[PDB]
Design a protein around this ligand. Structure first.
Ligand SMILES: [Mg+2]
Ligand SMILES: [Mg+2]
Ligand SMILES: [Mg+2]
Ligand SMILES: [Mg+2]
Ligand SMILES: [Mg+2]
Ligand SMILES: [Mg+2]
Lengths: 174, 174, 174, 174, 174, 174
């Protein structure tokens, strides 16, 4: 019954990795939601919509790397339902950015508990994997979103009106 | 309250399009499941896994075209939960292909009810849209999967063993 | 017994499409006839013969698209005899052009009854197909032949003699 | 007396298409008017003037496609007077954009009545034509103008003064 | 109230230039009419239709240069209705050419009264403008149309029938 | 009444060549039939369908060379009905190949009687023509089909199931 390729892969880890897969697919669905919002004809911020559409595609690629890992180690993937996003209508460019940042910190929090459970089961390949592909880029994302939120607040979003518009063109529009 | 760009777009259609979006995202999740299965170390059919991974990416692109349509016409997108796939373990290459085909016919059935409701509300742009981008490629998909299922059955899958292996290399491996 | 790929394809349509296939193959045979006539050593209008030979090849390509359609939808093709053309000897360049035009209108008339029967069975993919590939180019053909017949009559074909000759070089000879 | 190429083309449609031609030429004249306004030495928004000049040229190209259609089907074109635009002086960038949008919806409304009259006379080629070349791009225009009006209002046009200026450079100036 | 850029621009000239704009737009509409006529399925002279379509596009470009001039000098543009062309059906290639020539002489006559009114108000820039861009090319047009009318009459249009046909291919078809 | 270019062309030959034209058009229709069969969604052998579609196009080119010959020698072409193929459904890849081979031998048999009748009327150009363009390639076709039938039988078609599938990819799929 155990996989021919299975070696030093504890059950508690296999279960934790399945939960992290469901968490990345759900983040991917949240960015997709926001992207729909900024494409609305009475919000109309195209560069915001392209920005979150890209984040969406990147999160779906994190889920699939984890899907490969779990097959390489001889664990089995058990998919669950992907819950709908907290809300449909996201108010403003600055409110969507602050939720993105809150979301991205929670994904980060779960990877750090994942890493703490692999260190305490003595699984070095799994740890190295999380470190090399997840923890580092998750810290670059948070820092970037932290900077976007800072700039928008300074320019006086959302009360200013010209702030998101200029932000859309200069910072997100390359 | 009604969108500035809204014109000849009945409520019953806006609701139908939201349900079709949830149906494409769910198909996308089912292909993703199958792809995980053929990558398993004790199934090991790489060209099958690449085939369904591509179908997965294509269905997620159908959902996003529909997301654009609904914004262009001034309707609003209301995302629901995406339910987990019927099963986790898909038996064989021929059983996965027969379920793919059964799935793809149900997506087709819902587009034909969508088109019947747009014709009976007199919405010509919505009809043209469904016809030009959905109904045609949905018929090419079904015909292709119908042919794959036919060949596999003839070569004697799944009892033969060499049938999926050869099928994987010649028909799916370009 | 019913095809695995068959869906929303009424028997009355499958029968109508078979009759339209026989009608395109017969048109293809009529153009082939005319082309033989203008190659005759005592008619001798080479650019007329090249013109109808091309129309012949185009009609045989319409029949084969319809042959593909009927297989994609899971209907079955039932070929009949192709009847010989009304006549062997076609008098003149202007008489051959007026028969071509009368022929091309009858092909058009049958596609419009085909489309009226698919709309009344609720088959949207079949309708879109006929519209996108048949009705439009059938209207461009009729308009072109209508213009050729007009010019020839004006220049005084067939009594003039120099009219077809000049027509052969300037309008049909690029 | 009836055209040699005429087939399944009802009189009521020929009359409707003539009225739609006069409607596109009149829209073309309105955009030309606005373009003159933004070139005025005491408005001075060059990128607005280039934007409406282009819309003007596009509408004159819609009228000529319809002029071709009506000749291909063997109807006759009956040109009327083109009435002068509602006003000469258009106040602001945001007021010109809101009138453009109101205009573009009325052109859309007339194409949808045109399509409803071709469906009820059973003219499939005419319907396909309107759908494929008019209804789709008319919906992309409305959505775009809807977005421009939204942005300008948000930035605080016309009271702001810097809003149109920045809008002219970033959104319309490529 | 007077424009900041206005200098040596008499009211009587501003009014004359507005009337010349309406005259070029009306000529543009007349050529458009003729072009529709030669595209008719029972006239069928394609190179005649391309010839007048081009003249149409050129006249619409003369109107827009005048629209720029009037803005550069700080006058205001007051658009009127564009009246429908004298007739719908233009008989023959030679009759359409003789009306084109009569039209083009009347446009010329109005530019010469325009120039006589700018010389008698002492406006040198306006005079130079009319001379450099209008009077010269208006004389080349008349001479060309004069030559086309001469040739057609000689070959025996419209009684000959082969005359317009050959004319269409050799003189207008490059 | 006799053609100006007619020389040493006996009536009995002109009649024989007309019958051979009808025989090539009928072979062309039979290959077209088979090609439709292998494109069926429950046969599904694409490389077989491409193979017979090509043979179809080649036979229609043999008929047209003969149509040219008969015009060059000053005979007249008298087209007959093209009869429908013996059957609609062709069982298997090996059964279709054995009928193709039986068909291709009968075409060969008629060319050899044609050549025997031209030698006994003393028509050397007609003989050379048949020899140089027909008899040689007809012998290469038969030998090829003879080899395909041999291989399929050896691999154990049609009972094997994997035989046609592999044959489709290696021998017919280049
Ligand atoms: Mg991640
Ligand atoms: Mg789809
Ligand atoms: Mg056709
Ligand atoms: Mg339009
Ligand atoms: Mg001029
Ligand atoms: Mg042959």
């Amino acid at each position: 019954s155990p996989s021919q390729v299975r070696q030093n892969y504890h059950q508690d880890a296999e279960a934790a990795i399945n939960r992290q897969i469901n968490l990345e697919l759900y983040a991917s669905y949240v960015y997709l939601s926001m992207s729909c919002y900024f494409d609305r004809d009475d919000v109309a911020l195209k560069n915001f919509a392209k920005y979150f559409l890209h984040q969406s595609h990147e999160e779906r690629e994190h889920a699939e790397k984890l899907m490969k890992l779990q097959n390489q180690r001889g664990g089995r993937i058990f998919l669950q339902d992907i819950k709908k996003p907290d809300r449909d209508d996201w108010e403003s460019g600055l409110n969507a950015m602050e939720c993105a940042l809150h979301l991205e910190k929670s994904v980060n929090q779960s990877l750090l508990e994942l890493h703490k459970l692999a260190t305490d089961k003595n699984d070095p390949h799994l740890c190295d994997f999380i470190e090399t592909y997840y923890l580092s880029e998750q810290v670059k994302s948070i820092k970037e979103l932290g900077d976007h939120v800072t700039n928008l607040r300074k320019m006086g979003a959302p009360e200013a009106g010209m702030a998101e518009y200029l932000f859309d063109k200069h910072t997100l529009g390359h």
